[PDB]
Design an enzyme around this catalytic site. Structure first.
Site, PDB file in Angstrom:
ATOM      1  CB  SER A   1       8.578  24.616  -1.572  1.00 33.92           C
ATOM      2  OG  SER A   1       9.971  24.354  -1.852  1.00 33.92           O
TER       3      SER A   1
ATOM      4  CD  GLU B   1      12.165  27.142   5.269  1.00 29.37           C
ATOM      5  OE1 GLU B   1      12.329  26.781   4.086  1.00 29.37           O
ATOM      6  OE2 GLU B   1      11.029  27.370   5.737  1.00 29.37           O
TER       7      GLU B   1
ATOM      8  CG  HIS C   1      11.274  23.486   2.765  1.00 24.96           C
ATOM      9  ND1 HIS C   1      11.249  24.822   2.403  1.00 24.96           N
ATOM     10  CD2 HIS C   1      10.956  22.776   1.640  1.00 24.96           C
ATOM     11  CE1 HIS C   1      10.890  24.913   1.115  1.00 24.96           C
ATOM     12  NE2 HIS C   1      10.712  23.694   0.629  1.00 24.96           N
TER      13      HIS C   1
END
Length: 297
Positions: free
Chosen positions: A144, A238, A268
């Site tokens: 991320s 995602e 994710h």
């Protein structure tokens, strides 16, 4: 056509997540994420160190090859997350890669806004090199926000005449702070993992007024030339799909050896749910293999 484990997972995520549009204090979010963090496997061992002014752990699974290391940069929107929230998945990555991982507690916004995280990531990579680790024995990985920060650390290191690692593995990276990509709607309804304003608040906080297109805030806008071989994982489900698809094409254009894998049905950083997701486990194995392959070449 989907596995029962990812289906039971998505429902649980939908059930347990904060309703959309609702705005949660930062320190509630920080504490939330701390408090449901998975516990690392009992055969993972850990050593506290301080690196470039930050707390870190060396995260060592069994099988660790002497002389190898991974710089790991955890996720969390650049505003949360810690050694504790990521020890479990980095432990598994250390396992699959047969290399110890340095998990950096890098500076977080809003107390330390951009470029602080980048300064820390680069300073840690430097320190790894002052320790003795050879560039060809190095790898950098991150999920991320940590996934973007991987690319940002490389652009920045490179720009400062530092030699590049053997490989880099961004996982579900956020590499475009503008959040204007199509998959933010086309993909909204399939994603239980990320809301914005949610994600936009994070960018607002990280950036604190800085150019959202700055190469080091958003590497999808960066000169990627010279960067090491990449493996990018992302899930089809995602909102951050397009970040990875575009990162991949950016790297290709810039002459970088890139490999994009889009995992069907995945969410994710589905790596983090390895304890109950066969796909989490498999993709980590894959992150390992790729590291060792590029350390093989």
């Amino acid at each position: 056509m989907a596995g029962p484990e990812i289906v039971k997972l998505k429902k649980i995520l939908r059930e347990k997540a904060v309703p959309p549009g609702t705005e949660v204090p930062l320190d509630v979010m920080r504490k939330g994420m701390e408090k449901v963090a998975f516990k690392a496997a009992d055969d993972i061992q850990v050593e506290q160190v301080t690196v470039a002014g930050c707390a870190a752990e060396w995260v060592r699974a069994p099988g660790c090859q002497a002389g190898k290391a991974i710089l790991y940069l955890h996720g969390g929107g650049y505003v949360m997350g810690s050694i504790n929230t990521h020890r479990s998945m980095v432990g598994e990555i250390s396992r699959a890669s047969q290399a110890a991982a340095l998990l950096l507690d890098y500076r977080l916004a809003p107390e330390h806004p951009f470029p602080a995280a980048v300064e820390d990531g680069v300073a840690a990579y430097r320190w790894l090199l002052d320790q003795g680790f050879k560039p060809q024995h190095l790898s950098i990985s991150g999920d991320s926000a940590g996934g973007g920060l991987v690319l940002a650390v490389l652009v920045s290191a490179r720009d400062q005449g530092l030699p590049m690692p053997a490989s880099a593995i961004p996982i579900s990276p956020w590499a475009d702070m503008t959040c204007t990509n199509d998959s933010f709607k086309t993909r909204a309804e399939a994603d239980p993992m990320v809301a914005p304003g949610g994600i936009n608040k994070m960018a607002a906080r990280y950036l604190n007024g800085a150019d959202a297109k700055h190469p080091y805030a958003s590497p999808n806008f960066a000169n990627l030339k010279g960067l090491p071989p990449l493996l990018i994982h992302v899930g089809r489900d995602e909102v951050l799909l397009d970040d990875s698809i575009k990162l991949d094409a950016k790297a290709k254009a810039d002459g970088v050896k890139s490999t994009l894998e889009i995992w069907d049905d995945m969410i994710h950083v589905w790596h983090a749910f390895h304890p109950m997701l066969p796909e989490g486990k498999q993709a980590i194995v894959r992150v390992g293999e790729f590291m060792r392959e590029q350390w093989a070449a």
